[PDB]
Design an enzyme around this catalytic site. Structure first.
Site, PDB file in Angstrom:
ATOM      1  N   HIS A 122       0.894  -1.194   0.000  1.00 52.83           N
ATOM      2  CA  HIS A 122       0.000   0.000   0.000  1.00 52.83           C
ATOM      3  C   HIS A 122       0.908   1.213   0.000  1.00 52.83           C
ATOM      4  O   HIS A 122       0.576   2.141  -0.836  1.00 52.83           O
ATOM      5  CB  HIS A 122      -0.932  -0.107   1.231  1.00 52.83           C
ATOM      6  CG  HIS A 122      -1.838  -1.323   1.112  1.00 52.83           C
ATOM      7  ND1 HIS A 122      -1.893  -2.334   2.038  1.00 52.83           N
ATOM      8  CD2 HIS A 122      -2.752  -1.645   0.187  1.00 52.83           C
ATOM      9  CE1 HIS A 122      -2.800  -3.217   1.678  1.00 52.83           C
ATOM     10  NE2 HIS A 122      -3.333  -2.810   0.543  1.00 52.83           N
ATOM     11  N   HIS A 141       4.660   6.628   7.686  1.00 53.34           N
ATOM     12  CA  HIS A 141       4.507   6.316   6.300  1.00 53.34           C
ATOM     13  C   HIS A 141       3.998   7.517   5.581  1.00 53.34           C
ATOM     14  O   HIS A 141       3.620   8.509   6.191  1.00 53.34           O
ATOM     15  CB  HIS A 141       3.545   5.172   6.108  1.00 53.34           C
ATOM     16  CG  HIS A 141       2.191   5.453   6.627  1.00 53.34           C
ATOM     17  ND1 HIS A 141       1.737   5.253   7.892  1.00 53.34           N
ATOM     18  CD2 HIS A 141       1.171   5.992   5.968  1.00 53.34           C
ATOM     19  CE1 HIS A 141       0.486   5.725   8.000  1.00 53.34           C
ATOM     20  NE2 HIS A 141       0.159   6.151   6.802  1.00 53.34           N
ATOM     21  N   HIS A 176       1.642   9.114   1.978  1.00 54.41           N
ATOM     22  CA  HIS A 176       0.702   8.974   0.897  1.00 54.41           C
ATOM     23  C   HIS A 176       1.129   9.980  -0.191  1.00 54.41           C
ATOM     24  O   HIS A 176       1.565  11.087   0.149  1.00 54.41           O
ATOM     25  CB  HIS A 176      -0.750   9.297   1.326  1.00 54.41           C
ATOM     26  CG  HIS A 176      -1.196   8.444   2.465  1.00 54.41           C
ATOM     27  ND1 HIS A 176      -1.893   7.289   2.292  1.00 54.41           N
ATOM     28  CD2 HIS A 176      -0.954   8.538   3.791  1.00 54.41           C
ATOM     29  CE1 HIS A 176      -2.104   6.717   3.458  1.00 54.41           C
ATOM     30  NE2 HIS A 176      -1.565   7.461   4.370  1.00 54.41           N
ATOM     31  N   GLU A 226      -3.835  13.450   1.718  1.00 51.30           N
ATOM     32  CA  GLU A 226      -5.128  12.933   2.204  1.00 51.30           C
ATOM     33  C   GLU A 226      -5.963  14.096   2.748  1.00 51.30           C
ATOM     34  O   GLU A 226      -7.033  14.406   2.243  1.00 51.30           O
ATOM     35  CB  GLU A 226      -4.902  11.804   3.201  1.00 51.30           C
ATOM     36  CG  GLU A 226      -4.280  10.584   2.539  1.00 51.30           C
ATOM     37  CD  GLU A 226      -4.501   9.310   3.236  1.00 51.30           C
ATOM     38  OE1 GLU A 226      -4.287   9.277   4.460  1.00 51.30           O
ATOM     39  OE2 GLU A 226      -4.880   8.339   2.565  1.00 51.30           O
ATOM     40  N   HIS A 286       2.534  10.655   7.721  1.00 48.13           N
ATOM     41  CA  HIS A 286       1.817  10.313   8.943  1.00 48.13           C
ATOM     42  C   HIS A 286       2.782   9.679   9.922  1.00 48.13           C
ATOM     43  O   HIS A 286       3.340   8.603   9.622  1.00 48.13           O
ATOM     44  CB  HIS A 286       0.680   9.328   8.645  1.00 48.13           C
ATOM     45  CG  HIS A 286      -0.421   9.946   7.897  1.00 48.13           C
ATOM     46  ND1 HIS A 286      -1.416   9.216   7.254  1.00 48.13           N
ATOM     47  CD2 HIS A 286      -0.655  11.264   7.644  1.00 48.13           C
ATOM     48  CE1 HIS A 286      -2.192  10.069   6.675  1.00 48.13           C
ATOM     49  NE2 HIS A 286      -1.801  11.291   6.881  1.00 48.13           N
ATOM     50  N   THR A 292      -6.824   6.112   8.012  1.00 47.93           N
ATOM     51  CA  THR A 292      -7.206   6.417   6.637  1.00 47.93           C
ATOM     52  C   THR A 292      -7.092   5.225   5.686  1.00 47.93           C
ATOM     53  O   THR A 292      -7.377   5.360   4.499  1.00 47.93           O
ATOM     54  CB  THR A 292      -6.437   7.598   6.079  1.00 47.93           C
ATOM     55  OG1 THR A 292      -5.075   7.226   5.900  1.00 47.93           O
ATOM     56  CG2 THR A 292      -6.627   8.869   6.860  1.00 47.93           C
ATOM     57  N   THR A 293      -6.688   4.077   6.217  1.00 43.25           N
ATOM     58  CA  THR A 293      -6.698   2.805   5.520  1.00 43.25           C
ATOM     59  C   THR A 293      -7.512   1.854   6.343  1.00 43.25           C
ATOM     60  O   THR A 293      -7.643   1.942   7.544  1.00 43.25           O
ATOM     61  CB  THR A 293      -5.294   2.252   5.312  1.00 43.25           C
ATOM     62  OG1 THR A 293      -4.674   2.105   6.589  1.00 43.25           O
ATOM     63  CG2 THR A 293      -4.482   3.078   4.416  1.00 43.25           C
TER      64      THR A 293
END
Length: 257
Positions: free
Chosen positions: A61, A91, A93, A103, A116, A195-196
Site C-alpha cells: 500500500h 509512512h 501517501h 489525504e 503520517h 485512513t486505511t
C-alpha cells in the site's frame, strides 16, 4: 483485497469495512476560515531524541518506517492530548503528479504528499489494544510540497530500490525522524480515523500547518515503488491516498491565531 484501483479503491472499502461511512472518518478538508483558534490548546511536545528506528517495509500500500516502541523513547504529548503517545511507525501517501497526493486538504488544496507519524496511547499497553479506543492513537500529519530537497528524507529515498515490491523489507536503523519536521509546530486538530482499512475511529489528528519541501527527484523515487509483489505485472505505487470524507458533527481547532 483492498487497494487504490478502480475495482478495489476507496469507494469500495465500505463493503468490507462499513465504518468507512462512519461519523468520524478521515481525512477531511480543513476549511481554514472555519477552524477556530482554541487558546486552551497547548504546544505540541515532540520528543524524538531517543527514537530507534529498526526497519522499512513495503506493505503493498505504502512503505512503513518502523520503530522500537517497547519503551518511552519517541513520544508525543501536549497539544490536544492527555497523556503520552509512543511512536510506532511513519509512512506517506503520494500522488502520480505533484498536484495530488495528500489525504487532508487545506481549503481544497491538495499537496504532493502527506507524512503520517503514528503514535499509540501508552495507557492501553499496546497498539492493538489502543486502536480499539476513541483516544487510542495520535497521528501527526505533515504536508509535502515539491521544491527544495529535504536532506533528512534522502536516507529514506536511498533505500527504496531495495524494497520495490510488496513484502520486501530492509534494516533501517539509526534514522532520525526529527529531520522530517517543519520549522513551526502550529497545527489543526480534530477527532478522526485511520485512513486505511480497518478505518478505525481511534485517532486524534494533529495536522501541521507548515509543509515540508521535498525535491521532485525525491518524490519521483517514491513513484517508482510497486504495489505488486516480485515477479508480478508492474503497477506503480502512486495515488495511495483516500479522498476527504464528510466532516459531520466535528470541529477542527487551530492552535494558532
Amino acid at each position: 483485497h483492498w487497494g487504490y484501483g478502480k475495482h478495489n479503491g476507496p469507494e469500495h472499502w465500505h463493503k468490507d469495512f462499513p465504518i468507512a461511512k462512519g461519523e468520524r472518518q478521515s481525512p477531511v478538508d480543513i476549511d481554514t476560515h472555519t477552524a477556530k483558534y482554541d487558546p486552551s490548546l497547548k504546544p505540541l511536545s515532540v520528543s524524538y531524541d531517543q527514537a530507534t528506528s529498526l526497519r522499512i517495509l513495503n506493505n503493498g500500500h505504502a512503505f512503513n518506517v518502523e520503530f522500537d516502541d517497547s519503551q518511552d523513547k519517541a513520544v508525543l504529548k501536549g497539544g490536544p492530548l492527555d497523556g503520552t503517545y509512543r511512536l510506532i511507525q511513519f509512512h506517506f501517501h503520494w500522488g502520480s503528479l505533484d498536484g495530488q497526493g495528500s489525504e487532508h486538504t487545506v481549503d481544497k488544496k491538495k499537496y504532493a504528499a502527506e507524512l503520517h507519524l503514528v503514535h499509540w496511547n501508552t495507557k492501553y499497553g499496546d497498539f492493538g489494544k489502543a486502536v480499539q479506543q476513541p483516544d487510542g492513537l495520535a497521528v501527526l500529519g505533515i504536508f509535502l510540497k515539491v521544491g527544495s530537497a529535504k536532506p533528512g528524507l534522502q536516507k529514506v529515498v536511498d533505500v527504496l530500490d531495495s524494497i520495490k515490491t510488496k513484502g520486501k523489507s530492509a534494516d533501517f536503523t539509526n534514522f532520525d525522524p526529527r529531520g522530517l519536521l517543519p520549522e513551526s509546530l502550529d497545527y489543526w486538530t480534530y477527532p478522526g480515523s485511520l485512513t486505511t482499512p480497518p478505518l478505525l475511529e481511534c485517532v486524534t489528528w494533529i495536522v501541521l500547518k507548515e509543509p515540508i519541501s521535498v525535491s521532485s527527484e525525491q518524490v519521483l523515487k517514491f513513484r517508482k515503488l510497486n504495489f505488486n509483489g516480485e515477479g508480478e505485472p508492474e503497477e506503480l505505487m502512486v495515488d495511495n491516498w483516500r479522498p476527504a470524507q464528510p466532516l459531520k458533527n466535528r470541529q477542527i481547532k487551530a492552535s494558532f491565531k
